Structure formats: structure tokens, C-alpha cells
């Protein structure tokens, strides 16, 4: 199940790509700017449901998406 | 004194309010068309805002604001008359821009008036 | 097409449905 997670804050993982630095178009929970970390997973659907529950809560990464 | 500032021209169908301000949003003085004299319909005029925005352009001069950014809110007559009488009184225009709040289908409006 | 037919058929419904508010007991 090929799926991609980009993540922003300042079970086989196929790649990791920190782009590192762009400006945000609008300001997100105050702040400005941030990291751009595309995680590029190859994991199954059920686990990745509760990956986001781990990954959302820490606050290390400001926002999540999935593909 | 506010040496550089910002103006907010709300022009409704029934009124115009011109309020000159600093960039932080703390108003110095203001003028409406009803403040000049008028009652009822004559607040809504093309002329209304021309005479009011001179009364808004001064009082800015009392504190001493010599350049002012412009912000047009609302649909209504006297878009030009607010802009031009700010130039004609004093304080030459920095920048002009539309700030009419478009909703991304927000609340539902009132029912259709049929006259 | 023309709405004389339905305006004729309308006034039967109005004057019926007034009774079923009145009778209603």
C-alpha cells in the first residue's frame, strides 16, 4: 500500500526526504516558516491509521497529510 | 504623531465611514457622512463622502499624518470621492486595494426583498 | 397548459382543508 506523509514543524519506510526550509503561505498556529519532511511510506493501511495518532500528538510536527 | 499610517473606507449602500489610523490599527480620528450634517438618505450620496473624507483628511493633519495606505470595504457610491478628496485635502495616496470580505459560502443571507 | 384549470382545482382544496381544521374534535 504505497502512501506518502508530508509533515511540517520547526512496516517498511522506503525513503526519507527533509527538504528543510520554505516559507508558509499562511501562518499556522502562530509561528512562521518551517521544515518539510516527506516520509514516503510503504506500510499497510491499518497501522498508518494509528501512526497519525502517535505522530499528531507529539507536536513535533505541526501538520499531517496522507496519500 | 503617527508619521505613517493607514485609512479604512467602509462604504455601505446607506453610508460611508472614513477612519484614518496607524498601521497597528489604533485609530487617531474618524468621519462619517452623518457626522458632517446629513440625515436619512443624504448619508448615502456620492457627495456625502467627498465632504466627509476632507473632515477625515483633517484631524489626521492635527496629529500630522502625511502619507496613508488606503483600504476600500463595502459596495457603494463614492469609491472615487473618498480616494480623490483624500488627495485633494492633503496626504498623497500610498497604496489602494480591495478589502471587501468575500465569504466562501459562509452563512445564508436574508430572503429576497421585493419592492 | 393554462392555469384556469388548476385555479378551479385549487379552491376545492382550500375550502376543503379549512373544514379539517374546524372539524378536528
Amino acid at each position: 500500500m504505497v502512501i506518502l506523509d508530508p509533515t511540517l514543524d520547526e512496516g517498511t519506510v522506503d525513503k526519507v526526504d527533509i527538504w528543510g526550509r520554505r516559507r508558509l503561505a499562511y501562518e499556522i498556529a502562530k509561528h512562521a516558516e518551517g521544515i518539510y519532511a516527506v516520509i514516503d511510506v510503504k506500510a499497510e493501511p491499518a497501522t498508518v491509521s494509528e501512526l497519525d495518532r502517535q505522530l499528531n500528538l507529539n507536536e513535533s510536527v505541526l501538520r499531517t497529510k496522507v496519500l | 504623531n503617527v508619521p505613517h499610517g493607514a485609512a479604512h473606507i467602509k462604504s455601505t449602500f446607506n453610508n460611508t465611514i472614513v477612519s484614518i489610523t496607524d498601521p497597528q490599527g489604533n485609530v487617531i480620528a474618524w468621519a462619517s457622512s452623518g457626522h458632517v450634517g446629513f440625515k436619512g438618505s443624504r448619508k448615502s450620496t456620492p457627495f456625502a463622502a467627498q465632504l466627509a473624507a476632507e473632515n477625515a483628511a483633517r484631524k489626521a493633519q492635527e496629529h500630522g499624518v502625511k502619507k496613508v495606505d488606503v483600504f476600500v470595504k463595502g459596495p457603494g457610491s463614492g469609491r472615487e470621492t473618498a480616494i480623490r478628496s483624500l488627495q485633494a485635502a492633503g496626504l498623497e495616496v500610498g497604496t489602494i486595494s480591495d478589502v471587501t470580505p468575500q465569504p466562501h459560502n459562509g452563512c445564508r443571507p436574508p430572503k429576497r426583498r421585493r419592492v | 397548459g393554462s392555469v384556469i384549470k388548476k385555479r378551479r382545482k385549487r379552491m376545492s382544496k382550500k375550502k376543503h382543508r379549512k373544514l379539517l381544521r374546524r372539524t378536528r374534535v
Binding site: P6, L8, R22, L24, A25, Y26, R63, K65 | - | -
Partner: protein, 55 residues
């Protein structure tokens, strides 16, 4: 392609206006396939906060 995703902003800056709203198929002359894949990818990139909703 010209592959179309929400990653490449240099694509999406073409098909967006300066006031930040999506260009018509009448203006550009895309397929209906591609106007779907652009407008979804803009709406994705709008969540990612690469692009604004209007300047």
C-alpha cells in the same frame, strides 16, 4: 507529463491567478481529466500551506 502532484508549486503557480483562485478550462484549454487533477492538487497544496487562498 508534466506529471501533476501537489509537490511542484512551479506547476501550480501557472494555473492559479494572482488573486489566488483557480483558472478556468475556458482560459487555459486543458482536458477535464487535468482540471480535476490540478484543482484537487491545488486543494491539497492549500492544506499543505505551499499556496495561499488569496493575496
Amino acid at each position: 507529463g508534466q506529471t501533476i502532484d501537489y509537490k511542484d508549486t512551479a506547476l501550480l503557480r501557472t494555473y492559479i491567478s494572482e488573486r489566488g483562485k483557480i483558472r478556468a478550462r475556458r482560459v487555459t484549454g486543458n482536458c477535464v481529466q487535468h482540471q480535476r487533477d490540478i484543482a484537487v492538487a491545488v486543494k491539497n497544496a492549500r492544506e499543505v500551506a505551499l499556496l495561499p487562498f488569496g493575496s
